Ligand binder design. Structure first.
Ligand code: BCL
Ligand code: BCL
Ligand code: BCL
Ligand code: BCL
Ligand code: BCL
Ligand code: BCL
Ligand code: BCL
Ligand code: CLA
Ligand code: CLA
Ligand code: SF4
Ligand code: SF4
Lengths: 119, 61, 122, 61, 61, 123, 359, 61
């Protein structure tokens, strides 16, 4: 099921990972590295670790201050804040698994793919 | 009057001591949860009390 | 929360009545307890009438009464720091330290900066 | 009874010298963990002293 | 109960009793001064025997 | 039987006295996690007013949050160092990009309760 | 300076020709584990289901769910072992190995051959209960791991390159196969691991992706101590598997100590002893010799209770060490001689404890 | 007998203000959660049908 508050971080209900860099290779494939909230090891989104995401054992997120996020996140973030210190707001986007495309980010009612999303 | 002054003194103090034992004790339970030693204790005095379901049953009763 | 059982002991060991908030008052049936239940002793007072009777001897003493005033004075001051008004005292302290700087400069030639402190909630 | 107790404790103090108790081992590691269990224990002791000094101080003896 | 103090109307018993309390007060002044001295050296780890120049060990004695 | 110069080692029962017996890293608020308690703001040096408040509603409904101004932040790591944050919003990014939500994380474990066949905790 | 360990044991046996027994074991120890990484936890599950009586085939499963220093590690096995002859035993099975974000699957076609250096009638006649039997085992292995990951390919390329350039690969592979303290355990149980032999290392295409294939064969000899060799027929009660049998166990370990839970039924717990008398199966020697390796590092005090439950009408003829107390059909062991024998066998001793119960 | 009932009622009302004026609002929010779960657990075990109440707590303002 789920581990207790005492095991790992207490705030987390499932283990938490953050995509920290999204550089590309010579062939243009997106090399995604995600480190856990503790942050002492580097992993890539392999099927075995995606398989955890199907059962909710882990959760993946992206910061909006990432150096290579490709999409102009600050302008859109600034607009929403103005709708309802505005600059320096930072958010965590919850990455989800789409069987057809793999990891997608439902940003502003529009599904995206990590390769489409990142530079 | 003398019998009430001695009996009450050792009772208020006793109650105060019990409250502080739990306080200074939970003051140590915080240090371990933060350092993660909480899951490493083997004593029935901590092991039988790390289940959240068991807590809300004890507190519930 | 422990002040209640810590007071049910004080009341019970002084021969006070705890079964009723009013025992022995000159009222309808307060003085009928000793014979309705056939008690061999007569308790000093009930939870409320305890304060009236026990204090006849406190007011007669010039030192036991000084404790009554000091002890009450200390107790209410707890409301000032226990009530959710920590922020108010801080803005008030600001006006305090601003006013002192203002009064000291307008009257004297010196500058009086004491920066009035305020305790934290914890 | 000051001599009966001195015999019980000395015998009990030798048994714990050869066979120290392993109960609550986690306490041996930190001072405040042991100091708090002692304070939770001393308070119930003080309340007990208060309750017997009420029954005893007004005994015929 | 221990005989140091006595409930007596006679002034002689009241004067004799006073000498006993004064004696126990001076005695507790001497023993208290020893425990404070034996509480300063332990605190400052300066637990040196002033007669025999050799100091002692806390872990093994 | 000759020997080498003696080793002066007085550890046990001995009459001898014993002895006394840079802008590299970056910090951020995850705004969805922040509850605005401001514990981070008070660790920031007052001559470097990096952390600040941002209001958009009633406070009883999470209407306020904290944020680090990177233009003035000096990366002294005072807000992160002290484990103040109760939600994980205050996070740290190392010069090579790892994201730390807390300064030390307890190790993960399985969980089972140990019972005994014939002792007090039976079955 | 002595720490305390508490344990409870339980064996329930049926009557008639049944070898079925229920075993439950709980233990709690206060000394640090020898593992150089802590905390290390682990849960293991074994289930055996009979497929068909005439063939003698059975389906065995194994799941390993262990977290080592916050690193999730899982190994899964599903296999079909059956008795071919007195010395040969073929197994067909599939499994998966996952460490953190890494995982790889494998399929194997394997047979194990077990021969005794000698088979003399005089030993059988003059020794009613022999313990040591000298022998050797031979494994035929056909591994099938698909090279799905970038890392798998590199481990395979590297392996082929190493074989090609290093003549001493058959010898130095035993330094890899038994990592850290595992190498030392070999000499300890009087077990000799012979050099592996690579029949073939060929990549064969599969519908999913390129599949590195290894066909290897090895051998290993037991001076008599090894239970796989000395007891080859007893560790596989396939024919006695009238109903499914499961052994479930798990343990928690860290700097403070170890907590272990074990439970499950299976046949072979009771074996004929001669003269109409039954007897609990001889203790495996390899586990004791292997635990003396880590059990000799902390002075401890033993608190162990062994509750044995016999069938109706079935009463012990003899036990040493003798049961402390008795409760009609149930017999109890605790204290005195038994908690000396436990101190003996928890530190690596293999001293005999025999129970004979006749109807 | 009526002026004294006012004395009782009036005092009872006044000290209850301490419960909502002390900085224990966070404590009340947690406590209630235990009460909702406790009541849900009691109803669950005691009656086949499971009924929950989600006990409410006032805000500081
Ligand atoms: C009053 C209600 C609680 C209480 C609440 C607190 C609080 C609140 C604090 C401590 C803290 C301390 N407590 Mg406590 N503590 C109580 C009862 C005790 C008793 C006892 C007499 O049985 C002892 C030996 C201790 C021991 C101690 C120390 C471990 C520690 C630092 C003492 C210090 O510097 O005091 C001050 C030193 C002086 C010379 C002043 C006079 C103190 C006299 C000698 C009494 C000592 C106990 C008293 C409660 C200490 C705190 C006074 C503060 C005004 C609250 N507590 C009761 C049960 N305790 C602190 C800590 O670090 O906790 C983790 C802390 O913040
Ligand atoms: C440990 C001592 C021996 C050993 C003992 C045996 C025995 C005994 C036999 C095998 C046989 C096999 N061995 Mg071998 N084997 C060893 C080393 C190896 C190594 C290696 C990594 O070096 C490999 C690849 C193999 C490979 C193989 C397979 C081809 C085959 C079936 C294995 C299987 O299904 O396991 C299943 C997977 C598991 C994880 C099971 C682990 C079980 C543990 C060891 C004991 C559990 C039983 C418990 C005590 C009682 C449970 C009762 C319940 C009813 C289950 N062996 C060492 C050298 N091997 C079998 C055969 O004959 O095939 C024809 C068989 O009978
Ligand atoms: C005799 C008991 C001692 C005492 C001995 C200890 C010991 C020893 C320890 C604690 C420690 C703790 N104690 Mg203390 N402590 C005392 C007084 C108290 C009182 C109180 C009643 O006023 C309280 C609330 C506490 C609270 C606490 C915490 C501060 C701290 C960590 C929680 C915990 O142990 O969970 C554990 C709670 C459980 C695991 C659940 C209950 C376990 C079983 C059920 C208790 C046995 C009941 C038995 C079945 C009897 C039933 C009667 C029927 C006939 C069956 N102490 C009394 C005087 N205290 C722990 C610590 O580390 O402190 C630093 C710890 O190791
Ligand atoms: C101080 C004395 C203590 C004590 C001190 C310790 C210490 C210290 C430690 C243990 C450890 C262990 N103790 Mg001990 N222990 C005590 C008494 C007990 C008692 C009891 C009271 O009955 C029990 C039940 C246990 C139980 C255990 C286990 C939980 C654990 C060993 C696990 C194991 O079997 O790995 C089995 C291991 C293997 C099979 C090897 C796996 C790796 C190798 C490379 C595999 C090669 C085999 C090959 C592949 C197999 C076949 C393949 C198939 C055929 C296909 N101890 C006494 C009282 N014990 C050790 C441990 O691991 O703790 C976590 C440890 O460090
Ligand atoms: C001489 C000391 C031992 C002995 C030492 C060895 C040694 C050494 C080896 C064998 C080996 C074997 N021994 Mg011899 N052998 C003994 C006496 C016997 C007797 C008997 C009737 O006493 C029998 C039936 C056997 C049977 C066997 C075979 C199973 C095997 C070689 C046959 C083969 O592979 O073709 N041994 C005596 C008592 N035996 C070989 C083997 O591989 O066994 C597994 C081997 O190398
Ligand atoms: C304290 C331990 C006990 C003991 C415990 C056990 C246990 C436990 C078991 C046996 C078993 C065996 N025991 Mg015993 N055994 C003891 C004493 C003896 C004595 C004796 C006269 O003292 C003899 C002859 C035996 C005989 C035997 C064998 C029948 C058998 C091992 C089979 C085998 O392969 O061995 C054949 C011989 C060898 C393998 C080695 C060869 C003999 C030695 C190495 C060389 C002898 C040289 C001699 C001096 C002659 C002179 C040399 C000249 C140059 C010619 N034991 C001691 C006292 N023994 C096992 C069994 O019953 O299985 C069937 C077993 O499980
Ligand atoms: C591929 C592996 C082999 C195998 C290898 C072994 C080995 C090796 C041993 C046994 C042992 C036993 N086996 Mg076998 N066994 C297999 C399949 C079977 C089958 C079957 C074919 O249906 C049967 C009837 C049994 C039945 C039994 C019992 C007769 C006996 C355990 C006694 C007991 O209950 O102890 C009660 C205690 C427990 C149940 C504790 C179990 C603890 C955990 C779950 C297992 C630990 C194993 C090892 C230390 C750690 C795991 C390594 C793995 C690689 C993950 N096994 C397969 C074919 N089995 C032992 C024995 O003496 O056999 C005669 C023994 O030494
Ligand atoms: C005797 C009790 C008492 C006293 C003296 C004060 C005094 C004060 N309060 Mg407080 N307050 C009290 C009770 C008290 N309050 C209680 C019970 C509550 C809870 C409802 C509050 C809630 C509160 C809030 C929310 C705020 C204050 C603020 C203030 C300050 C603004 C008024 C001012 O400038 O001068 C007023 C005039 C004087 C202080 C003259 C002095 C009066 C006597 C001589 C003081 C000395 C007597 C003292 C009791 C001695 C102690 C002896 C010891 C044995 C206990 C002032 C220092 C405001 C502020 O600015 O905070 C800093 C503020 O925002 N009051
Ligand atoms: C008579 C006064 C009174 C009463 C009944 C309560 C009752 C309660 N408090 Mg409170 N509290 C009080 C005074 C009181 N408190 C004061 C003065 C303070 C300030 C120090 C606090 C501070 C406080 C905190 C900080 C917390 C509570 C909590 C709780 C609840 C946990 C105890 C429980 O589950 O059952 C206790 C047993 C009962 C309630 C039995 C009922 C007793 C009588 C019959 C209640 C009905 C009488 C009532 C006065 C009728 C009103 C008549 C009207 C004319 C005024 C409980 C509902 C905790 C909680 O969980 O919050 C929800 C919590 O965290 N207490
Ligand atoms: S690094 Fe220092 S200056 Fe920057 S936000 Fe943190 S505490 Fe403030
Ligand atoms: S300490 Fe945490 S919750 Fe509080 S303002 Fe900073 S980031 Fe937000």
């Amino acid at each position: 099921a789920v581990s207790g508050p005492w095991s790992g971080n207490a705030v987390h209900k499932a283990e938490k990972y953050f995509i920290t860099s999204a550089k590309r290779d010579r062939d243009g494939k997106l090399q995604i590295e995600l480190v856990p909230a503790s942050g002492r090891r580097k992993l890539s989104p392999t099927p075995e670790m995606i398989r955890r995401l199907i059962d909710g054992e882990i959760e993946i997120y992206i910061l909006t201050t990432q150096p290579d996020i490709a999409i102009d996140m600050n302008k859109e973030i600034i607009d929403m804040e103005n709708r309802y210190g505005v600059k320096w707001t930072m958010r965590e986007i919850p990455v989800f698994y789409h069987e057809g495309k793999g990891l997608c980010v439902e940003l502003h009612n529009k599904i995206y793919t990590l390769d489409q999303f990142f530079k | 009057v003398v019998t009430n002054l001695i009996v009450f003194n050792h009772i208020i103090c006793g109650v105060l001591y019990v409250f502080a034992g739990v306080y200074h004790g939970g003051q140590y339970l915080l240090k371990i949860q933060l350092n993660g030693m909480y899951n490493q204790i083997k004593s029935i005095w901590i092991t039988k009390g790390r289940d959240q379901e068991v807590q809300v049953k004890i507190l519930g009763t | 929360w422990g002040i209640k059982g810590l007071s049910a002991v004080c009341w019970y060991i002084d021969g006070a009545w705890i079964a009723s908030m009013m025992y022995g008052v000159p009222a309808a049936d307060a003085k009928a307890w000793d014979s309705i239940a056939h008690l061999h002793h007569h308790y000093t007072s009930g939870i409320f009438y305890y304060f009236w009777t026990e204090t006849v001897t406190i007011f007669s003493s010039s030192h036991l009464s000084t404790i009554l005033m000091i002890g009450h004075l200390v107790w209410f001051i707890s409301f000032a720091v226990w009530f959710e008004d920590r922020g108010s005292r801080l803005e008030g302290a600001d006006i305090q330290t601003r006013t002192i700087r203002w009064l000291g400069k307008k009257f004297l030639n010196r500058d009086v900066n004491f920066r009035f402190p305020v305790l934290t909630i914890s | 009874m000051s001599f009966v107790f001195a015999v019980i404790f000395f015998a009990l103090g030798i048994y714990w010298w050869n066979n120290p108790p392993n109960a609550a081992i986690h306490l041996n590691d930190d001072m405040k963990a042991a100091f708090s269990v002692h304070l939770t224990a001393i308070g119930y002791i003080n309340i007990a002293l208060g309750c017997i000094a009420f029954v005893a101080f007004q005994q015929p003896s | 109960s221990l005989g140091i103090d006595t409930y007596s109307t006679k002034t002689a018993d009241l004067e004799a009793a006073g000498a006993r309390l004064l004696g126990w007060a001076a005695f507790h002044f001497l023993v208290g001064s020893v425990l404070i001295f034996g509480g300063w050296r332990h605190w400052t780890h300066n637990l040196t025997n002033p007669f025999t120049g050799r100091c002692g060990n806390f872990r093994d004695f | 039987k000759p020997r080498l110069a003696s080793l002066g080692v007085t550890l046990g029962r001995s009459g001898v006295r014993q002895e006394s017996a840079k802008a590299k890293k970056h910090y951020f608020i995850i705004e969805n996690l922040c509850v605005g308690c401001g514990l981070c703001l008070d660790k920031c040096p007052p001559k470097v007013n990096a952390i600040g408040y941002k209001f958009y509603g009633d406070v009883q409904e999470g209407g306020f949050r904290c944020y680090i101004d990177q233009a003035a932040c000096i990366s002294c790591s005072a807000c992160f160092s002290g484990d103040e944050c109760p939600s994980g919003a205050l996070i740290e990014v190392l010069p090579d990009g790892e994201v730390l939500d807390f300064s030390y994380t307890p190790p993960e474990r399985l969980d089972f309760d140990l019972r005994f066949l014939h002792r007090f905790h039976r079955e | 300076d002595v720490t305390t360990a508490h344990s409870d044991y339980e064996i329930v046996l049926e009557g008639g020709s049944s070898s079925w027994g229920k075993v439950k074991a709980r233990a709690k120890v206060n000394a640090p584990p020898a593992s150089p990484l802590l905390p290390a936890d682990c849960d293991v599950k074994l289930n055996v289901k009979p497929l068909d009586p005439a063939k003698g085939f059975v389906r065995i499963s194994a799941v390993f769910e262990s977290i080592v220093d916050s690193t999730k590690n899982k190994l899964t096995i599903e296999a079909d072992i059956a008795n071919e002859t007195k010395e040969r035993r073929i197994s067909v099975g599939e499994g998966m190995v996952s460490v953190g974000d890494f995982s790889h699957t494998f399929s194997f076609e394997g047979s194990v051959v077990n021969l005794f250096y000698y088979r003399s009638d005089a030993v059988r006649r003059n020794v009613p209960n022999p313990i040591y039997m000298q022998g050797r085992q031979f494994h035929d292995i056909l591994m099938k791991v698909p090279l799905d990951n970038n890392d798998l390919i590199d481990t395979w390329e590297g392996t082929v390159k190493a074989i090609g350039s290093t003549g001493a690969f058959n010898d130095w592979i035993r330094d890899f196969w038994f990592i850290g303290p595992a190498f030392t355990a070999l000499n300890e149980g009087g077990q000799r691991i012979s050099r592996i032999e690579v029949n073939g290392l060929n990549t064969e295409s599969g519908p999913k992706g390129p599949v590195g294939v290894s066909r290897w064969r090895f051998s290993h000899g037991g001076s008599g101590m090894v239970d796989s060799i000395s007891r080859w027929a007893e560790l596989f009660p396939s024919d006695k598997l009238n109903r499914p049998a499961q052994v479930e166990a798990g343990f928690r370990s860290d700097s403070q100590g170890i907590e272990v839970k074990v439970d499950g039924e299976f046949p072979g717990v009771s074996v004929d002893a001669g003269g109409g008398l039954r007897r609990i199966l001889n203790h495996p020697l390899i586990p004791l010799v292997h635990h003396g390796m880590v059990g000799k590092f902390n002075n401890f005090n033993v608190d162990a209770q062994l509750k044995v439950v016999l069938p109706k009408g079935y009463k012990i003829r003899y036990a040493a060490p003798q049961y402390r107390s008795q409760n009609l059909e149930e017999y109890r062991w605790s204290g005195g001689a038994y908690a000396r024998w436990v101190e003996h066998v928890c530190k690596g001793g293999v001293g005999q404890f025999e129970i004979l119960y006749a109807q």
